[PDB]
Design a protein around this ligand. Sequence first.
Ligand code: HEM
Ligand code: HEM
Ligand code: NI
Lengths: 310, 310
Amino acid sequence: EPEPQMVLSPLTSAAIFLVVTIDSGGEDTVRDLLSDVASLERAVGFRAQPDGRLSCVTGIGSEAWDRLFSGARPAGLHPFRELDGPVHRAVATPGDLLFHIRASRLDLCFALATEIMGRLRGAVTPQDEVHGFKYFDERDMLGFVDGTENPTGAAARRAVLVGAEDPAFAGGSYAVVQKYLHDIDAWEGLSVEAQERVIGRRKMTDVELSDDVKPADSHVALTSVTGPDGSDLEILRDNMPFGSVGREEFGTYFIGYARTPEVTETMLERMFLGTASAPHDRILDFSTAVTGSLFFTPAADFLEDLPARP
Amino acid sequence: EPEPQMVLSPLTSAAIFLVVTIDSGGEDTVRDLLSDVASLERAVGFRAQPDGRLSCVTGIGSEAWDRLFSGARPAGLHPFRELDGPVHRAVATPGDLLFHIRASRLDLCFALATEIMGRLRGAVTPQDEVHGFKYFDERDMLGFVDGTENPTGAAARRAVLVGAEDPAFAGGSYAVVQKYLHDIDAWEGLSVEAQERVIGRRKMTDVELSDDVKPADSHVALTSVTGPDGSDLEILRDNMPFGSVGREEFGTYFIGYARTPEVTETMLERMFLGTASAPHDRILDFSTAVTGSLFFTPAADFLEDLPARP
Ligand code: HEM
Ligand code: HEM
Ligand code: NI
């Protein structure tokens, strides 16, 4: 009986990512928005349903949580753990609140972000805002199909949603975000055969590389992680391309939901710190991370009925 | 039997507007892109047909025209005439090339814009770049249905496409652009009735105010122009909203196609300078123009078989 937010969304061609920090003494204005946000989603979204598919997933940062809520905390909620790799850095940037707004059209996402930020105006300071558009064939900014091996339906739920491990917050999830910028000129200089050695899948056909062709330092290889037993651990990603052409900004907005942050964090360490037979993820030779933050996205039940302020 | 560019488009949800200036000695690269731009449009767009609806209207500024082409000039091509009215100013800004990119998906626009700019790189300098989205019910940032009294088909061609009057350039058109930003706060503080007296049509039903009622300083009244004969003088507009919710920007991007700049320019004068019967367009009390430029968008034929350089 707890309802989670729309962490498992259908395919949606548009998205707006909003990350803000809570000003001095903006705690109260925020908690009012947190209650209404579900209702607000419904207002912007209900006409233009069922095509629209407008949703919002709201996330709360580690430190912001303590300023906002009394009572117990989510089990594994900390601030984003910065990774200072030998070559590549996973930076950690400020964010107190996350709004993951998605729809089938960008104007719906825009209308709902306007409502959210309108009532938050004066209590929060914008940190990041990016509008994402999906390609007509699910490909990302590097030209590869993006999202293929995402857990689906029932296993997705089990991989993403808090359960009996933290009963107090079952139905919530942990969201990790990173805004990446690509060296498109560099990447496109590569042969397609060389690019597939980077990702770990065939570009066009989207078939994964056989176990002994797939390089140890390819993306798909490093992001496959298993548990201490004979079973593999997965996350839910909804990557969204973005960019400004004039500024030569070509991006991938990464977002990854998981039952516990330790899964996503493992994958991050393998990509940036590398393993024994892999100095790092080759995707990083073409992708530079300019922000990263960690949030708990609660059950929608938690937002309707908040705890008293600490 | 000269084919115009896709000035008359279907209805498109997405748009990118590019304005660049041409650097010293960039003229040659620019010409090479102009010759290939229709080609590139096909390249990006065909594999998305029919539903893609991707198109690019390419336009050239008055000064850039003499740097690029020998031979005849279009009869009406001058720089955007700055208007310095009693209250409001229509700024004139830098711009040599216009790329009016439209499709049903924002990603189709982004992709063509990437190819174009990649070619133009090293030879031009970005001046303006707006990504526009259209609301599901064809409304703009002011919440009024935008585009209702636009001309259609036969009447539109007659209104927009250069004819026998300037034969060397039949199939062309003159485009005027202005990026507008709105005092959204001010605007939303009016009553719906108040707002309708600003626009000249009823907000929610899009019926035009009757003659007696419609204020003489309302937007529709001021942009309703007749010639030296009885009949009306029309233009084709494809206004697009754009915005950033974080830095509190809510805008309309104006683009106005006409058979001769004179019609558009006349309207712009009544709006910013006034009338016997009105100080200025009431719409300007909520909208600030931040860019202005005038371009000639040649026949498709012209770009593919370019004149010699001078
Ligand atoms: C610029 C950033 C990124 C790009 C362009 C990108 C792109 C891709 C692509 C093309 C695939 C192909 C296979 C598939 O979609 O199933 C993939 C898979 C995957 N990615 Fe990434 N990705 C990015 C960042 C990340 C990050 C930061 C993580 C952090 C955990 C991550 C985790 C994964 C996982 C777990 C898979 C599937 C693993 C499997 O095949 O079992 N990705 N990504
Ligand atoms: C802030 C910028 C602007 C906004 C928000 C805006 C919006 C609108 C709206 C809501 C209408 C209602 C009627 C219709 O859609 O046909 C309209 C009509 C019109 N506008 Fe604008 N517009 C803007 C700028 C301009 C500019 C710069 C011109 C320059 C000539 C212009 C010329 C016209 C014309 C000719 C009509 C229709 C006239 C008729 O009813 O016969 N507009 N606009
Ligand atoms: Ni490397």
